[PDB]
Amino acid sequence: SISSLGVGSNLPLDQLLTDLTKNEKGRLTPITKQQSANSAKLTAYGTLKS
Amino acid sequence: VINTNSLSLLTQNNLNKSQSALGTAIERLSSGLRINSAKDDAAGQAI
Amino acid sequence: SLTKQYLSVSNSIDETVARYKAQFTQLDTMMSKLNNTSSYLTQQFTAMN
Amino acid sequence: LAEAAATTTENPLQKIDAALAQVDTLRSDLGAVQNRFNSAITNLGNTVNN
Amino acid sequence: LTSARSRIEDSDYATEVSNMSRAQILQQAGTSVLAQANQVPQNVLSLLR
Amino acid sequence: LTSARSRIEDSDYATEVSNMSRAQILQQAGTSVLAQANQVPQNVLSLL
Description:
This is part of a larger assembly, with two copies of chain A and four copies of chain B. By secondary structure, chain A is mainly α. Chain A has helices at 13-24, 29-49. Chain B has helices at 6-31, 42-46. Chain A binds chain B through residues 1-5, 7-8, and chain B through 26, 29-33. The PDB classes it as transport protein.
C-alpha cells in the first residue's frame, strides 16, 4: 500500500528513490529507437505495396 | 544511597520497551505492509 | 525479439528498484535509534556540565 | 582453413535452424544464470543484515 | 484474490501513525528523566558531603 | 561497459550514511569523555 519513506530518518530518501527509478529506465531507450525504426520500415513497405 | 540508581534502571527498561514499540510501528509504516517477518502472524504468511 | 528483451529488462529493473527500497527501509529504521542516541548524549552531558 | 564450396550445400535450412537452435539454447542459459545471480545477491544482502 | 491478499497484508496507515506518535513522545520523556535521575543522586550525595 | 564500471566504482549511499552516523555518535562521546577525563585529575587536586 501507500508508504511514507523517510518517517524515521527524516531524509530525502523518497526523492532519491524516485530519481533512481527515473535513471534506471534509461536502459530502455535503445530498444525504443530500434522498435520505432523497424516499425517505420514496415509502414514504408506497406506504402510501397500500395 | 549511592551504590545503585534503581530509578535509572527502571527508566532504562521503560525506554527499551518504548523503543521496541517505536521500531515495530516504523517498519510497518515505511514498508506499507503489516507483515514483515514470521513473528508478526503465523497464519498470515501461509494464507 | 525486441519485445522479449523489453519484458526481460522491465523485470530486471523492477527487481532492482525493490532491492533498493528494502535497503532504504532498513536504513530508515536504524536512523531513529541513532538520532535518539545523539539527543540523549547531548542532554546528558550538557546536564553534567 | 575452411575449404571452398565443393557444390551447392544440401538442406541449407536444416543447418541454419540447427545453428539457430544452438544459439537460442545458449541465450536462454545465459539469461537464466543472471536471475540466479540476482537471487544470490539478494541472499547476500539479507545475510549481511542478519 | 489480489484484494484478499492486500487486505491480509497491507498495514493500516492510521493505526501506524497513531502509535508512532505516542512512541516518540514516550521516548523523549524517557531520555530526559533518565538524565534527571542520574543527576538527582549525584547532588543528594555530594551535598550530604 | 558503462554499467559494469558503475557497479565496480560507485558506492552505496545506505552503507556510507550508516557509517557517517555511527562515527558522529563516536565523536560526540569521545569529546565529552575527554572533557571529563581532564576534569578527573582536576578534582583529585581539588580534594588535595
